[PDB]
Write a protein that binds this DNA or RNA. Structure first.
Ligand SMILES: [Mg+2]
Ligand SMILES: [Mg+2]
Ligand SMILES: [Mg+2]
Ligand SMILES: [Mg+2]
Ligand SMILES: [Mg+2]
Ligand SMILES: [Mg+2]
Ligand SMILES: [Mg+2]
Ligand SMILES: [Mg+2]
Ligand SMILES: [Mg+2]
Ligand SMILES: [Mg+2]
Ligand SMILES: [Mg+2]
Ligand SMILES: [Mg+2]
Ligand SMILES: [Mg+2]
Ligand SMILES: [Mg+2]
Ligand SMILES: [Mg+2]
Ligand SMILES: [Mg+2]
Ligand SMILES: [Mg+2]
Ligand SMILES: [Mg+2]
Ligand SMILES: [Mg+2]
Ligand SMILES: [Mg+2]
Ligand SMILES: [Mg+2]
Ligand SMILES: [Mg+2]
Ligand SMILES: [Mg+2]
Ligand SMILES: [Mg+2]
Ligand SMILES: [Mg+2]
Ligand SMILES: [Mg+2]
Ligand SMILES: [Mg+2]
Ligand SMILES: [Mg+2]
Ligand SMILES: [Mg+2]
Ligand SMILES: [Zn+2]
Lengths: 113, 53, 122, 206, 123
RNA sequence: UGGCACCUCGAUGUCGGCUCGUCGCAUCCUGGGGCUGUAGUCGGUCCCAAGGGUUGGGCUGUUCGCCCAUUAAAGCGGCACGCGAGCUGGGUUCAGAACGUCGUGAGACAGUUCGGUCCCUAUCCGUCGCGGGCGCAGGAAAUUUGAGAGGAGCUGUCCUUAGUACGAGAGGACCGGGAUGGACACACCGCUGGUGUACCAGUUGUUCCGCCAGGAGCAUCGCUGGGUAGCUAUGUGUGGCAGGGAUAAACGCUGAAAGCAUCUAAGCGUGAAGCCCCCCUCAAGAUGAGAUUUCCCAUUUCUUCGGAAAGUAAGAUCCCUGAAAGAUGAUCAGGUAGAUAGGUUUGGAGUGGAAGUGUAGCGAUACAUGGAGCGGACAAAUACUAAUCGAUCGAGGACUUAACC
């Protein structure tokens, strides 16, 4: 917490991000660099965690791809995310959802509000 | 772990140069006019800052 | 973070099915390898009838780890297991097809054949 | 060659034009004033003397406010000297702003490290432990003090003592952004010291 | 941070609850210097609950005050407890003062072990 | 490996490993050269050079050795075969037991095998940190010079020059430029993680708050899921960059002794990761006690003279509130000329939807009021509580000469 750092790192905050909680499915349109081309890759999964304050805030998205679980961590205010969607909202009782790492299908399902 | 030689009188007196204890920081009371410690309640007239406690 | 005596399963079509690490190439005192690093290793469990036999000393590359890599953009990737692909003297796989997701960092290490065969390059 | 004095405010991060993310250190460098100029004909060496923060007239003393009165300024809290500096500039009583630097400049950061108290050998000097099992009774001890022949132990035998609180220079640090209105300098990376510590920013010597 | 008083986290929790209740009941006690610099924070944070007057505030302060009788009145001789006095007697006194409901006065060393003793009083 | 028996039997602990190193050069790698039966890439041999570096495992108590896989390389030796008042105790060299062999026997081997008590509160020097005193011809507050000393010093791969030089081909450069790593070192906590016993939540048993509801004690913090400040690596930033002077081996110019020849006698030029500098840190007790800027001034009593004491000036301290500091001193932030600490009011990270009431359900329970309630150490305001009042220490500046006086 510091008032001077808050004012300096304010023009870089992203005003386009929506409101999401840990426990709901999101789709991330991330800009990906090839050898020479720029394309957008889609990452869809459930939000596992969300920590930080201000420009230093990050969040984590988990999906199971080809039978192997993958987790991807992003800064909230990065310009490398074209846009972010909230597909569905789930009911959870935790702020950190680490129990889904030791937990496979039909038992890792999240309810809906 | 055991003294090789006994300590002389001079060497035993030099070491005790710093084993003294300092003089108390006492002060004259404003009300009853006798000695007391600074920032402390006077033990005789039972007053601090000019008000009885 | 893979060092000597670390086991990691094989993720391609060759005969090997589990592998134990022998040495991490790159330097005299090097003691840790991560995504995109080549290691010397031995076969501890093989599927019957495969090309690669048990007890064989082979080289291999690391395609995914439980503690993944960080990109220059400030983002992170982690997987749920440590995986492995057996390679030849050059950077070509000894198998026919790859299983599971594969990190993007191999595209920066000139492992172009393994990238093409992967179902997903995350 | 330029130079200012500042206070370590904190650490944060910024996004560059490529989208890359870097860590930076915030330094506030207001109220810099030139106090004295030292020359060869009077001292034998050339330097410029700078004062960083003014303080209340109660905290100052009689000798101090007669020295800053030559430059027509309020008594200052931190005073340091800069060498290898062109004396043609730096008129007495002038204000030193953060605009002397610019984006992309390479600097050096001098400060006093954070304080660690009485510390042992494997934290202070990064030595190894002994076995924690197999019947051993040697865990966090210094080691052998030397051979038998000298009948003594040599100098520079590293042992426990007071660890921190010493001056450190970190070289070749980049400048990411300069904010003249807020008197703030953004330096990419780390600088020695705790919060509110004095930092001496000088151009790179190499 | 906060200071450990030569006792574990369970003894320390109990020590602060006995000393904070004694200052409410008696309003003037003898303790040591370090032991009084600590109950200076747990007592003023307790008057603030009494200045709210809520049921939520009363239930929160009831988890700290010990259950002991300050004195017995015949309203029908019914006892009066420390929680009642805190919310009905002590708290209304400081309805205008913002902070600093206590003061400390130094006395001198104690004969038995040389400990520095002080007065902490609730005004 | 031995010879002698000079110190030690009123006790000089004996192999291997661990922690910590330091020195020699008869150089393992890197640096510079001469010769080659040196085409190129590789090599052999010798000369200069000790600046840095010199791996992880299998078997064995093992040093040694062989093997597996790497590396630029996996050097040889000294220091009581360095190091047990620093560690271990696998081997050796105590009492038990068994095998083979020897002995009539009790027993033995310098054969094997299983098990087998490693004591000590540091006096002096020595080493690593931290204070007090006096000194530095007046008393003070800051900023500094650097005599001297310590640290650092390592190196791989890829691209280009160039498929050029070389070579019949196969193969394949020197010199130069750029990028990026291994090991190591310093600093820091914004990021990824760890911890986080006065933060938040779920839950079992039993006792208590008279009962329900709501809570408290004990059970490893009772257990479980998270986590603030601080401290941290495996995390992040940076470093060994580019150079100068004199040289070693070596290669040369001019040049006689000795009409030629000759790198030598006189005189000149190149020439190493090495020396002295450049880079980082300490440093005027450097008794050789240095320098600059600023502040206070020339009091009063006594002495026979050297001189003394007693109020002070500038300044500092005793005492008190503390942390960015700390074993204690010390350092630093402050003492009403006040935001130093606590409290209070707004926030923040963190946790996750409080109590009360109401609705739905037979009930466990769910929903609403409501991102609610709580919230150590984090931020800003506020003088409300405590830094009250006081006391102590601390100058008046010797003599000679020299430019002006
Ligand atoms: Mg959050
Ligand atoms: Mg132990
Ligand atoms: Mg307990
Ligand atoms: Mg001999
Ligand atoms: Mg004889
Ligand atoms: Mg004897
Ligand atoms: Mg002996
Ligand atoms: Mg003896
Ligand atoms: Mg022996
Ligand atoms: Mg030699
Ligand atoms: Mg050669
Ligand atoms: Mg030995
Ligand atoms: Mg010894
Ligand atoms: Mg026997
Ligand atoms: Mg017989
Ligand atoms: Mg055994
Ligand atoms: Mg001892
Ligand atoms: Mg961190
Ligand atoms: Mg109940
Ligand atoms: Mg309980
Ligand atoms: Mg009980
Ligand atoms: Mg816990
Ligand atoms: Mg926990
Ligand atoms: Mg160099
Ligand atoms: Mg030269
Ligand atoms: Mg001086
Ligand atoms: Mg603070
Ligand atoms: Mg002070
Ligand atoms: Mg305050
Ligand atoms: Zn009195």
């Amino acid at each position: 917490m510091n008032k001077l750092i808050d004012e300096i790192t304010k023009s870089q905050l992203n005003p386009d991000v929506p409101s999401f909680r840990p426990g709901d499915t999101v789709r991330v349109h991330a800009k990906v660099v090839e050898g020479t081309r720029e394309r957008i890759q889609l990452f869809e999964g459930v939000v596992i965690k969300r920590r930080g304050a201000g420009i230093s805030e990050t969040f984590t998205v988990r999906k199971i791809s080809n039978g192997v679980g993958v987790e991807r961590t992003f800064p909230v205010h990065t310009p490398r995310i074209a846009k972010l969607e909230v597909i569905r909202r789930g009911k959870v009782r935790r702020a950190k959802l680490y129990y889904l790492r030791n937990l496979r299908g039909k038992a890792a399902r999240i309810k809906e509000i | 772990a055991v003294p090789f030689r006994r300590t002389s009188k001079a060497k035993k007196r030099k070491r005790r140069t710093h084993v003294k204890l300092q003089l108390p920081g006492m002060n004259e009371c404003s009300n009853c006019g006798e000695y007391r410690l600074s920032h402390h309640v006077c033990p005789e007239c039972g007053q601090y800052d000019g008000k009885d406690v | 973070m893979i060092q000597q005596e670390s086991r990691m399963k094989v993720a391609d079509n060759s005969g090997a099915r589990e592998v134990l690490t022998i040495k991490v190439l790159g330097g005299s005192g090097r003691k840790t390898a991560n995504i995109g690093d080549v290691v010397v290793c031995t076969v501890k469990q093989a599927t019957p009838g495969g090309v690669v036999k048990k007890g064989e000393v082979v080289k291999a590359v690391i395609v995914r780890t439980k503690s993944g890599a960080r990109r220059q953009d400030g983002s992170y990737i982690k997987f749920d297991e440590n995986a492995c692909v057996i390679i030849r003297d050059d950077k070509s796989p000894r198998g026919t097809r790859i299983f599971g997701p594969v990190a993007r960092e191999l595209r920066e290490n000139n492992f172009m054949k393994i990238v093409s065969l992967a179902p997903e390059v995350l | 060659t330029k130079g200012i004095l500042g206070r370590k405010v904190g650490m944060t991060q910024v996004f560059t034009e490529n989208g890359e993310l870097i860590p930076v250190t915030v330094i506030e460098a207001a109220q810099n004033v030139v106090l004295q100029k030292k020359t060869v004909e009077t001292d034998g060496y050339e330097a410029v003397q700078i004062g960083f923060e003014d303080k209340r007239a109660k905290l100052s003393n009689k000798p101090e406010q007669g020295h800053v009165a030559k430059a027509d300024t309020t008594p200052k809290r931190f005073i340091r000297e800069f060498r290898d500096v062109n004396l043609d500039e730096y008129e007495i009583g002038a204000e030193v702003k953060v605009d002397v630097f610019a984006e992309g400049d390479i600097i050096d950061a001098t400060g006093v490290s954070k304080g660690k108290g009485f510390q042992g050998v494997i934290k202070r000097h990064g030595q190894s432990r002994g076995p924690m099992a197999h019947g051993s009774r040697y865990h966090r001890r210094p080691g052998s003090m030397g051979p038998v022949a000298p009948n003594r132990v040599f100098k520079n035998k590293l042992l426990p003592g007071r660890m921190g609180g010493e001056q450190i220079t970190i070289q070749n640090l980049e400048i990411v952004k300069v904010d003249v209105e807020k008197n703030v300098l953004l330096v990419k990376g780390n600088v020695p010291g705790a919060k509110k510590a004095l930092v001496q920013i000088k151009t790179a010597t190499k | 941070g906060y200071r450990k008083l030569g006792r574990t986290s369970s003894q320390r929790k109990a020590l602060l609850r006995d000393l904070a209740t004694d200052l409410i009941v008696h309003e003037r006690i003898e303790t040591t210097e370090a032991r009084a610099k600590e109950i200076r924070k747990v007592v003023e944070k307790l008057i603030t609950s009494g200045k709210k007057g809520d049921l939520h505030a009363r239930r929160q302060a009831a988890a700290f005050i010990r259950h002991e009788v300050v004195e017995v009145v015949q309203v029908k001789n019914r006892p009066v407890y420390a929680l009642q006095k805190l919310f009905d007697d002590v708290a209304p006194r400081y309805a205008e003062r913002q902070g600093g409901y206590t003061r400390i006065l130094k006395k001198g060393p104690r004969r038995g072990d040389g400990a520095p003793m002080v007065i902490i009083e609730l005004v």
